[PDB]
Amino acid sequence: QDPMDIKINGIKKYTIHVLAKVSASGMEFTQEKDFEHQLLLTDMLETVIRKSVEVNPVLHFHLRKSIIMNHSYFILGLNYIPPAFATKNVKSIHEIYQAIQDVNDLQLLDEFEKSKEKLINKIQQYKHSDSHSGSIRLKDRLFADKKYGSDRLGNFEKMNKITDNIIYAAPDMVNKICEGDGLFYHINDGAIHISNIKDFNYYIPAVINEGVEDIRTDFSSILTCAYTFEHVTDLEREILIPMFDGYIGKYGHSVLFKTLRLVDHISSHYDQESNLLFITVLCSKNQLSTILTKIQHTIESIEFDSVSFSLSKVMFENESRFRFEDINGLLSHVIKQHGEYKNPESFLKAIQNTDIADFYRLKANMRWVGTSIV
């Protein structure tokens, strides 16, 4: 029996029920030395188990090794038709465990090459993403560890040289997925159920190489700037800074679009994992030095106002509402958020209660740390 039944009321009523287990790991993912191996076996396992479990009433089976605030978690999920609308009842968690333990080693070997190619492709696409490439380079140098940037989806060299004797580590993974302690989440009938209260403590890497310039030479240009924030609170990392990023980055006439239209393809993003705000824009080399100084001066002398701040609050609430619309966005939210933020109503209420004085605290704690150009 679960120690608790934390029922969060007032949830959108979905056509399906969800049953998910989240298994913790006190090691920051750089400490894991078999990281690339654990990824590959997890995908192999998910593919095989899916073929056995994704039958009526189960519509989708999910099994991933995911990173949440620089800690790795095994996340198992089950989407299914509720029994009132189903011609067959859903398997219990015990029976789901039994299907995972009944996975055949030959079934896993048949997926080894296909799963290895799938993960190899995800690493290359991630590292080669043109707009996303700049930010990867900064995190490698800002944190003096390429696991935070280039190797976040696995080191390519380690992943590429894995042979099929990884099959002998499958029992260890099956045991960790089935027997590792975790929290259970259950979405049904307009409510979310959590089996216990445990706010897994986040980890954010501290900056070491402050002030980074990354010169590059290659013809047909890109620029990426990074800032960090000091004394980041949960309210800031989850609400205020995302609002601030939208304020200056994408909410219509953002500060940067208006500022750079004077010169006359702008993007910005706050990475909650690394506590970094990135700003990337395509430009010409003749516009490079000007736009760099122009972007820097704009951020330095940034000001706010309550009318436009009220609009950012409305916009960011609606963006959160759109994520809650998706049963997977809701589940992901309730998994990741701490304490009362787990309730979407409380999270939305917390957005409505922010004031402009919070942005001025955030501006004082803001500081440039990096730059990359191609």
Binding site: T15, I16, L59, A86
Partner: protein, 343 residues
């Protein structure tokens, strides 16, 4: 399958006349947002290539005001796009704002005056968008054409409204713009599929075997079957779909270069006797599962309303149509596809 689920979905689904237009309503209890969609039929404009897209850009303007800016200040993002037969105006908001946002949107859509400088400005924008006879045809149309076309096509009678999520009903009292009519009735569903949709290096193959809903079923079924057979033989065959709300028939798009391979695959369908029957069974199971999953996303529900006219039809009629697709329906369309491919 399970009757109580289909009955559950249908009690939330309704469609009624509001003023001189029609509103399809799917209520979702405790949804976080509501999707509103206003859909204008512009199929007749396909003979004036690019006129519908041009009109779409004009409709954001009324007395110097831009409705995207007005919506943005209200915290709502207005999106619009033009397909071959319809122009959509879609937005998400909290339910409390739905009535005022919808009536403001219809205020712009049913405005029919556009001065010369607005027309020339939007033309210039579209010409640069061309570079980033579509450009030629709008260059041969002036203010009197666009205003006449607005009065003929941008009317309540030629409008479908879809509101998904929330629990409040749409009525005429709250949307008085739904009677902003002109002297012009709903236009004929004529369409220039022959020029805009296909170019001389493709062919259209009709999937039409009587039933509006079943035409969508059979069209997807045959497209999926051909794609799977091409995967096994490792063909390179691209099979596009022309499935449009105002078209009773559905259509397959195949490159004229892939016609021989496609023709061989169509003939390959009846080779295995049990392949068609078991693929129909798989498709019916996959269709119901995907509908269950898709009926959680507002935009996906909207796609069922546009593709299958859900609202006019019930979900029970949708699944009844799906369950009635048999091997003889596939063979009958197979035969008609081969006759078209022969000549």
């Amino acid at each position: 399958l399970n009757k109580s689920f289909v009955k559950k979905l249908d009690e939330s689904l309704n469609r009624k006349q509001v003023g001189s237009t029609n509103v399809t309503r799917y209520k979702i209890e405790d949804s976080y947002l509501v999707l509103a969609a206003v859909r204008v039929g512009i199929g007749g404009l396909t003979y004036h290539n690019g006129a519908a897209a041009f009109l779409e850009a004009l409709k954001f303007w009324r007395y110097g005001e831009n409705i995207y800016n007005l919506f943005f200040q209200r915290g709502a993002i207005l999106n619009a796009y033009t397909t071959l037969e319809f122009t959509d105006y879609v937005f998400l908001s909290k339910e409390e704002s739905i009535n005022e946002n919808l009536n403001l949107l219809l205020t712009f859509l049913y405005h029919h005056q556009y001065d010369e400088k607005t027309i020339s400005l939007e033309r210039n924008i579209i010409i640069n968008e061309i570079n980033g006879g579509s450009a030629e045809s709008i260059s041969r149309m002036g203010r009197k054409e666009f205003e006449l076309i607005s009065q003929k096509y941008y009317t309540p009678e030629n409008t479908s409204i879809y509101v998904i999520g929330g629990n409040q009903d749409i009525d005429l009292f709250h949307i008085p713009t739904a009677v902003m009519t002109t002297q012009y009735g709903k236009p004929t569903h004529k369409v220039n599929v022959n020029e805009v949709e296909m170019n001389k290096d493709m062919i259209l193959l009709p999937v039409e075997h009587g039933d509006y809903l079943k035409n969508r079923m059979i069209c997807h079924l045959i497209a999926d079957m051909i794609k799977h057979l091409a995967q096994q033989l490792e063909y390179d065959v691209s099979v596009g779909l022309f499935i449009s709300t105002n078209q009773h028939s559905c259509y397959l798009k195949v490159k004229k270069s892939d016609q021989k391979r496609f023709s061989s695959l169509i003939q390959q369908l009846s080779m295995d006797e049990h392949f068609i029957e078991t693929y129909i069974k798989d498709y019916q199971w996959r269709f119901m599962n995907e509908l269950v999953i898709n009926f959680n996303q507002l935009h996906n529900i909207y796609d069922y309303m546009t593709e299958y006219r859900l609202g006019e039809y019930t979900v029970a009629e949708l699944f009844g149509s799906l369950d009635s697709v048999d091997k003889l329906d596939i063979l009958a369309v197979r035969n008609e596809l081969i006759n078209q491919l022969t000549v």
